[PDB]
Amino acid sequence: TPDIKLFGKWSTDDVQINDISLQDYIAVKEKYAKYLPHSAGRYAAKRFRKAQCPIVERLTNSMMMHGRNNGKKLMTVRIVKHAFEIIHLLTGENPLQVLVNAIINSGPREDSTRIRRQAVDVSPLRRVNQAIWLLCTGAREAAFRNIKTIAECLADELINAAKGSSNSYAIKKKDELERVAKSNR
Amino acid sequence: GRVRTKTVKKAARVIIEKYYTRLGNDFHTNKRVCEEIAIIPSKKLRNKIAGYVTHLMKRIQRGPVR
Amino acid sequence: SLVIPEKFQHILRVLNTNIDGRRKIAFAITAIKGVGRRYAHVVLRKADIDLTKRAGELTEDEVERVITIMQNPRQYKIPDWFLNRQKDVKDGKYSQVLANGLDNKLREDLERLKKIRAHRGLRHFWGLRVRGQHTKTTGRRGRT
Amino acid sequence: GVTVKDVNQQEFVRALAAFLKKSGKLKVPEWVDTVKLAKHKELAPYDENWFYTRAASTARHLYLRGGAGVGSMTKIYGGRQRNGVMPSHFSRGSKSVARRVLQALEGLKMVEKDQDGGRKLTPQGQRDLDRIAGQVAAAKK
Amino acid sequence: QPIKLARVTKVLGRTGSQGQCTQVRVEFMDDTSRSIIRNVKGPVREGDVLTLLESEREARRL
Amino acid sequence: RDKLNNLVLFDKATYDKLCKEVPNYKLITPAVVSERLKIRGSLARAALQELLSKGLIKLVSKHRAQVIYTRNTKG
Amino acid sequence: GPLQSVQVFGRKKTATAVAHCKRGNGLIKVNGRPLEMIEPRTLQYKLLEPVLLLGKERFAGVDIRVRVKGGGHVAQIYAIRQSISKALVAYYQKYVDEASKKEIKDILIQYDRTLLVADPRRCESKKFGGPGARARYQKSYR
Amino acid sequence: HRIRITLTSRNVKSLEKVCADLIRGAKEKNLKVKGPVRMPTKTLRITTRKTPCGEGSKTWDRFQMRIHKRLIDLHSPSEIVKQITSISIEPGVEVEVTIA
RNA sequence: GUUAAUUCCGAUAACGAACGAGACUCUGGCAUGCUAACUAGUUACGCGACCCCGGUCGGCGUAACUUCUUAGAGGGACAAGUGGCGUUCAGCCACCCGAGAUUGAGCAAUAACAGGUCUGUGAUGCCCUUAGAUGUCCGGGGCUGCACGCGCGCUACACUGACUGGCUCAGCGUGUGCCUACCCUACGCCGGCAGGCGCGGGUAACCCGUUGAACCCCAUUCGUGAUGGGGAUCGGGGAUUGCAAUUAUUCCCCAUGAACGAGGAAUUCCCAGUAAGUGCGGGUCAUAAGCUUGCGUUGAUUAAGUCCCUGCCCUUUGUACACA
Ligand SMILES: [Mg+2]
Ligand SMILES: [Mg+2]
Ligand SMILES: [Mg+2]
Ligand SMILES: [Mg+2]
Ligand SMILES: [Mg+2]
Ligand SMILES: [Mg+2]
Ligand SMILES: [Mg+2]
Ligand SMILES: [Mg+2]
Ligand SMILES: [Mg+2]
Known part of the structure; x- marks a missing residue:
């Protein structure tokens, strides 16, 4: 059937990737539109099959972290579902556009490495990986020993990062990394 | 690392001149040739011998093999 | 309903021990030594105290009803195996020790x-x- | 023509237990409140009317699979027992609760001690659970 | 000072003191005549687009 | 290094407060309600339930780990 | 008329789901329960992917009864999804013309290959000297 | 007339040979039999430490002992079946006859 | 030049060889093709119970059948097809079709260690002791002792949670003994639990057992407080095992409610059904797992590279080293 929509609630169409640099490394469109952020697997078998995994799936896989909840996919799936619900009624549009915009603005574009350190740019694939890593770890630390649930900690982290407000944890790390890299240039 | 050991290579280099008229071009037909025309202790070794013989024939067509 | 009552007492004094009124009644009375997370629950069911009410909310008759149950457990169908001083050496009496009595x-x-x-x-x-x-x-x- | 299988099981037990409360013919025990449901548990059941649910749950279980004796009921309701600084294990439920529940559902005609051991669901008791599925199925719609 | 983006033409090899950075040559789509060699951190295909914060320094070959 | 002093029951200064602007929040949740009014988590759950019955907030989702409320649609 | 029956199985880690598809009026039921009432409910669209991607008109005229045994909660979910898709293909192959199986098989694969081909991954044995297949106990040099 | 014979042996190559012969050894005398039914293979495992001393890397042995089981049944009286099972038995295979 | 490989192509004062690697064995995958199945099942049929012709029924019986279960024989995969790279050879990369285009183990060379084992042996040289015994047996104690240092682990520090109910899924595998006592358990009553009492099955695809396992899932209560997180320590009581439990064997009930708020320098293991979470079996066992050895379940981030650190293999080179 056409118009496969996430959770049966959010339409994957009308989501536009503005940055052509990461267009081919974010899977939102018709070929990767799925009813659930759950999938079988077989994405780590080769080097670049990771880019054919739907982006919402890649976010769910970045939520089974810190020991207490390794291999708990059902709890992570429902967390993203509730988070996508309250992003919509707090921002007013499809959360997919919110999540995609956060990925674009949060993935650092330059890093330093031991070759004193030298400044090198980041490949498009790692830019996606760093974004998902940074967005999730911000929500994790904002929800630890706090009354507010993990769902809304993940909701505002995507919202704040999408606007690039600098009050989100992911952005505070990106500019840090790019400012250090510039000093190492 | 699909490198043919001398055991697989030697049998192919002996079978091929004794039965060049029978051995052909496809892998499955000459897989049946080798099973009866020479005793092979195992299937997996028979397939490797028959596969190399198939590769050897194509070389023979273009020019003589040393 | 959800409005603070005028009689709400932030600290109750039972058996020479402070009780947090802001806590649920079942777990608040655990503060006195000799009652645990379970003996408190049965005591508040031997009598009729609404478990949803907080400690500082129930009336003074209700709390003084609770105190009497604890010090006389066998009188109100509390099973004999539910006591912490069953078959002692002094008087052979299955009794429940509380507060300073447990320390002494x-x-x-x-x-x-x-x-x-x-x-x-x-x-x-x-x-x-x-x-x-x-x-x-x-x-x-x-x-x- | 609805049946226990075709209706949502989660709220089916809730409705079936409330029917038992309305009947008032269960012969509940006298230590319903001072007993702990199983050794692996830590506190008494939060709801005071758990015995109506425990009877309802077993009656539902006897519908799906018959011949379930007391030793079966203790295994079905068992769970993880946290043993302090020990790794947790699996501990069976209480026998007395299962025995008095099964004897409760037999006092009124809902079960019978069928051959080969254990208990099964009587033909008239099967009707009662099928009547409940009728009201639960239509209530959601 | 604008920011340029470019596409890789091929992968030259793996460099760095620990083999963690790759040298590739990039080709601007803004100008189809200018190509330079740059280090890139992470797995990189052929034909993808690299966001160059500044595009004035050239990476020495290995 | 900081201590929360959350009340358990509304004062008359506080019950009237959340009948004014809480039904005007875009996002309504016992977690977010607690930190704005400095009240216990359970207290927000009981209060948000009563407001649900009155029809001044509509339920959008309900899970054992989180219940989510919105405000009524404009006009 | 003649009975139009075909019995196909589905595979996962250990869970297997054999589905008896006959000719009926559009009935679907698993272990005597419908698809929507299948725990866990959070993984409900996984069962509904073949039916939604094809519609009820293709499932009209047949009845499916899936029985399962083995595996875990999630493993079974991917077994019922496996059998119902395979059952529909194996029906249109034998009792309907070939032109009806092809476009069905195109639709199913382009959504995901694993909806008609089994997954070979299986748990691997544990070696001595480690808590698992590849993990090892801590070294204690000093 | 219902008689069942059991074939338990460690060797799977020989156990089939006797199995094959008795199916032929019965069908030749035009008496109907039910086919060779195979109980699941039974594996016996004794995992032990390699070294008699204390030191070394912690190494273990994986010993196995498989048991293959076969059943055949005949509808014939006792006098025929006694000589059927008394001929050409592999030393590995053991034969035990029971009356239903 | 190539390969995981002294693996091959090929050069060639070398020729023909030998071991090791590979080959090989077990195991995982998949075959609606073959052989079969009352100690495995399916479908149809006929009953019966219940809901309103249909539906459910691990309630019953039976006519075919082998898809699901089991276990045998064969098959199947070979860098074989295609496109590039390459001395055009050895081979490498990708794609098509495919269940699969690197599953995991076992075995495993010459030479050596003054590595461990005399406490595995009726394997053993030599030395010692042998009747007030270093022989053997009996009773008691100890191998657990506590100012301290170190190693392998378990439980935790909580809300991605704990508690209370409901709901729903396994796979390996054991089970009544030569002496030898010591088996696994269904069912029904008694008790709040541990447990006790009568009764049956099983020497086992036959019974426990459709192994109703946890995690997970749904619904409550708690609300950032060392708190319903955590369960150390300690008091009272009741059982089981055993000829005997005190220095508490183990189990159960009530109460008691310590440290711990993520862990310095430092360091370990790991890349796919893998890490990690989670439970279940065997071993040890009269009483018996925080250990080990296996099994299933839920199930990832990162990476397809390097010789920088730690080391290993081949060639050249230096050496005053040779128990190096
Ligand atoms: Mg939180
Ligand atoms: Mg259970
Ligand atoms: Mg030595
Ligand atoms: Mg020595
Ligand atoms: Mg001497
Ligand atoms: Mg010792
Ligand atoms: Mg505490
Ligand atoms: Mg606790
Ligand atoms: Mg020199």
């Missing part, structure tokens, strides 16, 4: 064992482990 009662048992110079009395006197577990590499930071 413990110190008499400790001096009772040392009275006859039993092995467990000596271990308690020396401040070591008494239930036969190893002391080679554990319980170190306490013993200097």
